[PDB]
């Protein structure tokens, strides 16, 4: 029912400017541009707006605190993030927040939502479908697949199917 989306940045929320400088969108704008319409009664917090290569440990603290503040209020949380360090973030968060009462789903995209063939809509559709599932825990949603956050790794640098559940069954996938 009530779903909070937290922005962290990443390609998902990008629109490279007319010279060579990446610029960032708010998470709310990202959803509108992706074209997610079912998502009503959805709140939006913007926490960072960086390329995830820039992610430092302190960011995990900010993010966990934010999350801890919001678990009792929301039924599912989604966090948009750069793919580069997504699995680091997802894993670390999994240790800080040992027993989440709600699904906390990380996602992102390789092609920015603004672009024509972006993987953003699918990833977000996926993330939202699962955020409503009632499945407690920290997850990653990518390329129509949901993975335990603490078993996910980036395996491809230039493909939509960038992630894999390693040594552990995929939790769910649209197949």
């Amino acid at each position: 029912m009530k779903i909070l989306l937290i922005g962290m940045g990443g390609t998902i929320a990008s629109v490279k400017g007319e010279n060579g400088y990446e610029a960032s969108l708010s998470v709310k704008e990202v959803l509108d541009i992706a074209g997610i319409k079912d998502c009503e009664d959805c709140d939006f917090l913007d926490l960072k707006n960086v390329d995830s290569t820039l992610i430092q440990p302190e960011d995990w603290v900010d993010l966990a605190e934010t999350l801890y503040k919001n678990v009792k209020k929301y039924d599912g949380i989604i966090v948009t993030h750069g793919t580069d360090t997504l699995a680091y973030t997802s894993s670390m968060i999994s240790f800080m927040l040992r027993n989440p009462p709600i699904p906390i789903v990380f996602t992102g995209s390789m092609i920015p939502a603004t672009e024509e063939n972006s993987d953003a809509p699918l990833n977000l559709q996926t993330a939202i479908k699962f955020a409503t599932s009632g499945i407690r825990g920290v997850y990653v949603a990518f390329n129509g697949k949901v993975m335990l956050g603490v078993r996910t790794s980036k395996v491809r640098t230039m493909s939509r199917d960038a992630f894999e559940s390693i040594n552990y069954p995929i939790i769910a996938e649209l197949r």
């Binding site: 909070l4 708010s26 709310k28 709140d43 939006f44 917090l45």
Partner: peptide
Amino acid sequence: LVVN
């Protein structure tokens, strides 16, 4: 701070 949240947008609805």
